[PDB]
């Protein structure tokens, strides 16, 4: 085994060889030279990240105040309009004309139900809606089990028809506005503009079971947040059909709950235990509810019935005050069949003043006495609900919000506050969106205070979407580098706006569906959960980020600079990036907005080119017939002008881009000058490289392909044969290697993938990249990332000439940080190239981490898909490992032993690059396995919830809670 | 005991005296007696020892 100085001297002649090959062939110092040679085609402006945040915080203020004004007027009209409605019952005499969504639009149908008359609308196709729509009226959604033509429903479509004039007045004023909808108390919803619903009832074989009342946006503006506590009778009598019904009501009751709502679930049969692991009221987020809905299911019923230990346990649960709580409506609901005891004594003290509200549910078909339960409900200002059937569950476990809304409708105007929802997928397929809601109240005869019998309910709730693609147009990231971004946050820790946030729903648990019990054609529910990713789950968690995260939940302003490690774009690397954060509150709302920058991004380039010939000359550089002397040029699909659209077929896009500058001068009076201009300047900078430097050295021996991925989207792979293999995203702010090249001050090597499809190994090769780094007036800039795809065959020859091509004595390999295998001596390893090195000899890799040579961090990706397990895709959690050098020390000697054998490995790290060289004795001499240490998205179901909630994340609830008005009717059950 | 977790209704049981009287009379006329017996058998696990 060679000495430590021989490995030292032999690494230094093959890290000097790779870097000279990459410093020379790519042209780092040449592209630095021509950015500095000009100085005057551009100027260098600063990103004032105090100022940028303040500017952004105000476009989201004004956007969400403009939405709010529209909401207020609609509400006023609805209140005024229905106070002048007459309650007619002759509807076959005077037809109600409306367009009904989810109905066949074929003219020849003509069903013509009594009372109603439909509309055939004309349906232009649209952008900002990715569906055909009509701007002349509002559609109407009736849920499926609700009959339309009922006097109760027919009378909504009469009075609600005056909203189409106010609907129209909102979009005339603001073209950008998205869905406008009124969700009725009656269960009928009207939205503008009209479009056909996505599931028709019976024209396909999937049938929608969508109810407006059920909806989260409808619920948050229906009522105030609430600490509930589900109390269930588990005595022997319940077992049977009735027990079956309860498990489906509680799961149903929960659907109703929200993040702001706290909830626990207890259960009694002569003792009250608590159904799961929790013991206090927990946040009823997606996870906690998933635990409770998984413990409600396994319940078995036996024993007697004591309504006294069940309500003692409930009240005690209600009084914890140590835990984090909603502290608003306090209510307890019991599911039971029949009661012989009213438990008068427990209610006298625990709730002598009736602070708590009790709702009693009688379920199943049975003969047990319901008088005592009704009495309990009446005594406590709750309500009573029967459920005999499965189809009766859905409208009675949502109906309690008519009771809880009462002291809000007695609060008057004070209760008309806009609230904005958690991001969620739109019913109509719009994408991620948030809705601002306002409740409409039933005011009839207010002038004189004549009735009030049913004047304590809301007419319904009114909402208006903001799409998250609308907010991302108020937070522009182009001036800032790929590293910089804006993050938005609730007072709940959830992230409103984040690079990491994705359309797929956030998943819980490992998905298990039983194929042996899905009959083929019945169509179960798909999903309704909100997409609540948290800030400490969108990014790698620190302790110096939980400080930042708490500090901008409680509405403060500030900046912070620290060293933290960024997870890479692809999930394979972790790079220590020195960042600066800066946050401020959006003053109209409860969102607070932040901005990450990396020091060195504090300055950007603005293009200062305006000459006729210079913008002209740089623009034919990106012509696809002129790639024989330029290099297969790419171009990023920014929204350059409003007219040319991002196309995802890039040769399509670059023609429509470059047609645009010929057919019209780049002045373009409805199109931003700087973004297009910067691109033009850039293409004259990645031209002078490809003309005056790369086309001189037309073939370097080991060099396969040469790229300049730059800022302005223009990536230039140098031979067109090589550009067929360029499998990157052509958007330069989505490339992984672009972003890892900017963090590092040394050449970076990217490992090719293992297996997969497409040619990514011998054909393209392993790639090196390096950020260009210029200084203008003593101000650091990193404009571009040069690079090289390496030839893996040639590199091997230099490497071979104490390791032989076929050596049994000892094997040596080169590994980039992250532990991936790039170059291998054996030839059974270099076939499996770009593979995680702990999968080809897991014994050595395990030891290396122990020596402190390597470090890692497992994280959770709450938005990913996986195949089900037997117990096409669902959402699930994956755990993800990344590996990264944590020790700066250059060399590491030692020996590892498996038991009865030693192997002496020597590790040396090449200077000036992330690569590491290790020499070790052949694996075959000691037959050892430990277990195969693998690095992949690995399906898992963590972290366990029962341990998170003992020390929950900081949170801030709603300031205004409406409950317990003294003059509430409290007489109807 | 006719407390099976199904939504099927079994009107002929022995839950109280009047109902039990009717069921006995029914088994006596022989009308649907086998159906009544099946319920009773299922109330003890099924067709086992
Ligand atoms: C001389 C002859 C000497 C022998 C005479 C015969 C002896 C009869 C002994 C049995 C008599 C028992 C009848 C009295 C009785 O206690 O019936 C109780 C029964 C309870 O039913 P009820 O309270 O109405 O509620 C039904 C739903 N839970 O009430 C009923 O269901 C009544 C049904 C009618 C009975 C015929
Ligand atoms: C004039 C007429 C006067 C007649 C009155 C005399 C009364 C007759 C006494 C019958 C008492 C039967 C006692 C056996 C019994 O109740 O069942 C015990 C056993 C319990 O099992 P268990 O767990 O309850 O149910 C689940 C089964 N895996 O389950 C079993 O083992 C099933 C045994 C039930 C057999 C009942 C026989 C009744 C015969 C009627 C005769 C008339
Ligand atoms: C493997 O090792 C070889 C030899 O060191 C290395 O070589 C290429 O080697 C030749 C041998 O002299 C170099 O001349 C050649 O470099 C160029 O010519 C002169 C030499 O001083 C200088 O201008 C630069 O070194 C460089 N510039 C040129 C010619 O444009 C050198 N480069 C190539 C690729 O031909 C291989 O690169 C090593 N294997 C790799 C690529 O890792
Ligand atoms: C709910 O439906 C009813 C029934 O269609 C609507 O009432 C109708 O309202 C219109 C305009 O308010 C009435 O038109 C007027 O008719 C009189 C003659 O009757 C004429 O003098 C007026 O110049 C005008 O043309 C219509 O007659 C009336 N129908 C009845 C039976 O009274 C009502 O408007 C609908 N509500 C909403 C909010 O849309
Ligand atoms: C808003 O509140 C008002 C009352 O404050 C509600 O109006 C009431 O609606 C009921 C519906 O059951 C009407 O009662 C019906 O009366 C007819 C006679 O026309 C009778 O045939 C029916 O059997 C039933 O009793 C009642 O007339 C009406 N009250 C008033 C004062 O107009 C209204 O329904 C609420 N708004 C919404 C959208 O529900
Ligand atoms: C958000 O609103 C706050 C006030 O509630 C603004 O703070 C003010 O800032 C101005 C100068 O910008 C000062 O003159 C005032 O004294 C500040 N307010 C108070 C009460 O001291 C803040 O500038 C706003 N920020 C944004 C982004 O809109
Ligand atoms: C992420 O990895 C880093 C390794 O660089 C971890 O940081 C070290 O954590 C240990 C305890 O696990 C401390 O003793 C060291 O002082 C830390 N070193 C540095 C440089 O921070 C970090 O804990 C990991 N994060 C997680 C969540 O495991
Ligand atoms: C105590 C009880 O019956 N609860 C069950 C538990 O025993 C079981 O381990 C779990 C998973 O099957 O489901 C629940
Ligand atoms: C298409 C194909 O052959 N895929 C294979 C896969 O079956 C195998 O498990 C893997 C080894 O990691 O190599 C690849
Ligand atoms: C900051 C830190 O931990 N540095 C250590 C260093 O002290 C040690 O010499 C080296 C070799 O083990 O590993 C690293
Ligand atoms: C895995 C292995 O080789 N274990 C060896 C065994 O073969 C040998 O018989 C024994 C005595 O020398 O020592 C140990
Ligand atoms: C808000 O409304 C005003 C007035 O219609 C308009 O000028 C402005 O552009 C709107 N802002 C946003 C972000 O929609
Ligand atoms: C982080 O900050 C220190 C001190 O300002 C600086 O020396 C270092 O270069 C920064 N980190 C990186 C990766 O540049
Ligand atoms: C290093 O390995 C030793 C022996 O296997 C072990 O006791 C120790 O925990 C390891 N160090 C770390 C950091 O895990
Ligand atoms: Ca009972
Ligand atoms: Ca018969």
Swiss-Prot record, chain A:
Its main location: membrane. It is a single-pass type I membrane protein. Binds gabapentin, an antiepileptic drug. The keyword Calcium applies. This is Voltage-dependent calcium channel subunit alpha-2/delta-1. The MIDAS-like motif in the VWFA domain binds divalent metal cations and is required to promote trafficking of the alpha-1 (CACNA1) subunit to the plasma membrane by an integrin-like switch. It comes from Oryctolagus cuniculus (Rabbit). The lineage of its organism: Eukaryota, Metazoa, Chordata, Craniata, Vertebrata. CDD domains: vWA_VGCC_like. Keywords: Calcium, Calcium channel, Calcium transport, Cell membrane, Disulfide bond, Glycoprotein, Ion channel, Ion transport, Membrane, Metal-binding, Phosphoprotein, Signal, Transmembrane, Transmembrane helix, Transport, Voltage-gated channel.
Curated annotation (Swiss-Prot), chain B:
Residues 19-40 dip into the membrane without crossing it. Residues 1-18, 41-49 are extracellular. Phosphorylated. Phosphorylation by PKA activates the calcium channel. Both the minor and major forms are phosphorylated in vitro by PKA. A motif (Selectivity filter of repeat II) lies at residues 29-32. It comes from the Eukaryota. Detected in skeletal muscle T-tubules (at protein level). It is found in: Cell membrane, Sarcolemma, T-tubule. Ca(2+) binds at residue 31. Component of a calcium channel complex consisting of a pore-forming alpha subunit (CACNA1S) and the ancillary subunits CACNB1 or CACNB2, CACNG1 and CACNA2D1. The channel complex contains alpha, beta, gamma and delta subunits in a 1:1:1:1 ratio, i.e. it contains either CACNB1 or CACNB2. CACNA1S channel activity is modulated by the auxiliary subunits (CACNB1 or CACNB2, CACNG1 and CACNA2D1). Interacts with DYSF and JSRP1. Interacts with RYR1. Interacts with STAC, STAC2 and STAC3 (via their SH3 domains). Interaction with STAC3 promotes expression at the cell membrane. Each of the four internal repeats contains five hydrophobic transmembrane segments (S1, S2, S3, S5, S6) and one positively charged transmembrane segment (S4). S4 segments probably represent the voltage-sensor and are characterized by a series of positively charged amino acids at every third position. Pore-forming, alpha-1S subunit of the voltage-gated calcium channel that gives rise to L-type calcium currents in skeletal muscle. Calcium channels containing the alpha-1S subunit play an important role in excitation-contraction coupling in skeletal muscle via their interaction with RYR1, which triggers Ca(2+) release from the sarcplasmic reticulum and ultimately results in muscle contraction. Long-lasting (L-type) calcium channels belong to the 'high-voltage activated' (HVA) group. Belongs to the calcium channel alpha-1 subunit (TC 1.A.1.11) family. CACNA1S subfamily. This is Voltage-dependent L-type calcium channel subunit alpha-1S. It comes from Oryctolagus cuniculus (Rabbit). The lineage of its organism: Eukaryota, Metazoa, Chordata, Craniata, Vertebrata. The gene is CACNA1S.
């Amino acid at each position: 085994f060679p000495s430590a100085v021989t490995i030292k001297s032999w690494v230094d002649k093959m890290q000097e060889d790779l870097v000279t090959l990459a410093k020379t062939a790519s042209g780092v110092h040449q592209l630095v030279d021509i950015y500095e040679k000009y100085q005057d085609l551009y100027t260098v402006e600063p990103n004032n990240a105090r100022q940028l945040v303040e500017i952004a915080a105000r476009d989201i203020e004004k956007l969400l105040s403009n939405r709010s004004k529209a909401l207020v007027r609609l509400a006023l009209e609805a209140e005024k309009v229905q106070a002048a409605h007459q309650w007619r019952e002759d509807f076959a005499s005077n037809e109600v004309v409306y367009y009904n969504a989810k109905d066949d639009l074929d003219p020849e149908k003509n069903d013509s139900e009594p009372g109603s008359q439909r509309i055939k609308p004309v349906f232009i196709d649209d952008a900002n809606f990715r569906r055909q729509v009509s701007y002349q009226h509002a559609a109407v959604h009736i849920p499926t089990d609700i009959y339309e033509g009922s006097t109760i429903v027919l009378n909504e479509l009469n009075w609600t028809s005056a909203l189409d004039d106010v609907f129209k007045k909102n979009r005339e004023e603001d073209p950008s506005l998205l869905w406008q909808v009124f969700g009725s108390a009656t269960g009928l919803a009207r939205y503008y503009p009209a479009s056909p619903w996505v599931d028709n009832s019976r024209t396909p074989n999937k049938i929608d079971l969508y109810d407006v009342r059920r909806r989260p946006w409808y619920i948050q503006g229906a009522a105030s947040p609430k600490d509930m506590l589900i109390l269930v009778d588990v005595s022997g009598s319940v077992s049977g059909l009735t027990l079956k019904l309860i498990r489906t009501s509680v799961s149903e009751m929960l659907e109703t709950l929200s993040d702001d709502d706290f909830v626990n679930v207890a259960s009694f049969n002569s003792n009250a235990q608590d159904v799961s692991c929790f013991q206090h009221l927990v946040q009823a987020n997606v996870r906690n509810k998933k635990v409770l809905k998984d413990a409600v299911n396994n319940i078995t019923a036996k024993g007697i019935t004591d309504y006294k230990k069940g309500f003692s346990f409930a009240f005690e649960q209600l009084l914890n005050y140590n835990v984090s709580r909603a502290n608003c409506n306090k209510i307890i609901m019991l599911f039971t069949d029949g009661g012989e005891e009213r438990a008068q004594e427990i209610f006298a003290k625990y709730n002598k003043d009736k602070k708590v509200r009790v709702f009693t549910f009688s379920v199943g078909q049975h003969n047990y006495d319901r008088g005592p339960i009704q009495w309990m409900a009446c005594e406590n200002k709750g309500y009573y609900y029967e459920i005999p059937s499965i189809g009766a569950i859905r409208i009675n476990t949502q109906e309690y919000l008519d009771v809880l809304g009462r002291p809000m409708v007695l609060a008057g105007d004070k209760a008309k506050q806009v609230q904005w929802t958690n991001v969620y997928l739109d019913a109509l397929e719009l994408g991620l969106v948030i809705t601002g809601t306002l409740p409409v109240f039933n005011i009839t005869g207010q002038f004189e205070n004549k009735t009030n019998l049913k004047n304590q309910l809301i007419l319904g709730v009114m909402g208006v979407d903001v799409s998250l693609e609308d907010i991302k147009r108020l937070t522009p990231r182009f001036t800032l580098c790929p590293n910089g971004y804006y993050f938005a946050i609730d007072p709940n820790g959830y992230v409103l706006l984040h690079p990491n946030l994705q359309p797929k729903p956030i998943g819980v648990g490992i998905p298990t569906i039983n194929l042996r019990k899905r009959r083929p054609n019945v169509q179960n529910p798909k999903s309704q959960e909100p997409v609540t990713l948290d800030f400490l789950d969108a990014e790698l968690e620190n302790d110096i980020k939980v400080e930042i995260r708490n500090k901008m939940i409680d509405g403060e302003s500030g900046e912070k600079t620290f060293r933290t490690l960024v997870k890479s774009q692809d999930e394979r690397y972790i790079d220590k990036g020195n960042r600066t954060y800066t946050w401020t509150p959006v003053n109209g709302t409860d969102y607070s907005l932040a901005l990450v920058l990396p020091t060195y991004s504090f300055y950007y380039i603005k293009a200062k080119i305006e000459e006729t010939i210079t913008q002209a000359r740089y623009s034919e550089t990106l012509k696809p017939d002129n790639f024989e002397e330029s290099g297969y040029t790419f171009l990023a699909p920014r929204d350059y002008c409003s007219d040319l659209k991002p196309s995802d077929n890039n040769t399509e896009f670059l023609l429509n881009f470059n047609e645009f500058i010929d057919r019209k001068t780049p002045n373009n009076p409805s199109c931003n000058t700087d973004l297009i201009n910067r691109v033009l300047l850039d293409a004259g900078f990645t031209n002078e490289l490809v003309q005056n430097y790369w086309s001189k050295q037309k073939n370097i021996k080991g060099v396969k392909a040469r790229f300049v991925v730059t800022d302005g989207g223009i990536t230039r792979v140098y031979p067109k044969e090589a550009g067929e293999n360029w499998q990157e995203n052509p958007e330069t702010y989505e490339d992984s290697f672009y972003k890892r090249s900017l963090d590092n001050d040394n050449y970076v090597f990217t490992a090719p993938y293992f297996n997969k499809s497409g040619p990514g190994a011998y054909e393209s090769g392993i790639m090196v990249s390096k950020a260009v780094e210029i200084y203008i007036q003593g101000k650091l800039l990193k404009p571009a990332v040069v690079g090289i795809k390496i030839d893996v065959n040639s590199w091997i020859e230099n490497f071979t000439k104490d390791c032989k091509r076929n050596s049994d004595v000892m094997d040596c390999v080169i590994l980039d940080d992250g532990g991936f295998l790039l170059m291998a001596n054996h030839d059974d390893y270099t076939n499996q190239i770009g593979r995680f090195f702990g999968e080809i000899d897991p014994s050595l890799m395990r030891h290396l981490v122990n020596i402190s040579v390597y470090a890692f961090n497992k994280s959770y990706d709450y938005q990913s898909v996986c195949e089900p397990g037997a117990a096409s895709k669902q959402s699930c959690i994956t755990e993800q490992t990344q590996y990264f050098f944590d020790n700066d020390s250059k060399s590491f000697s030692g020996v590892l032993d498996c038991g009865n054998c030693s192997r002496i490995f020597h590790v040396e790290k090449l200077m000036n690059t992330n690569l590491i060289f290790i020499m070790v004795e052949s694996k075959g001499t000691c037959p050892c396995d430990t277990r195969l240490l693998i690095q992949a998205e690995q399906t898992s179901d963590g972290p366990d919830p029962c341990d998170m909630v003992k020390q929950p994340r900081y949170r801030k609830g709603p300031d205004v809670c409406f409950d317990n008005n003294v003059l509430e009717d409290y007489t109807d059950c | 005991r006719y407390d099976f977790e199904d939504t099927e209704v079994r009107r002929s049981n022995f839950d109280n005296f009047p109902q039990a009287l009717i069921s006995v009379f029914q088994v006596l006329t022989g009308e649907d007696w086998n159906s009544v017996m099946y319920n009773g058998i299922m109330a003890y696990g099924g067709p086992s020892y």
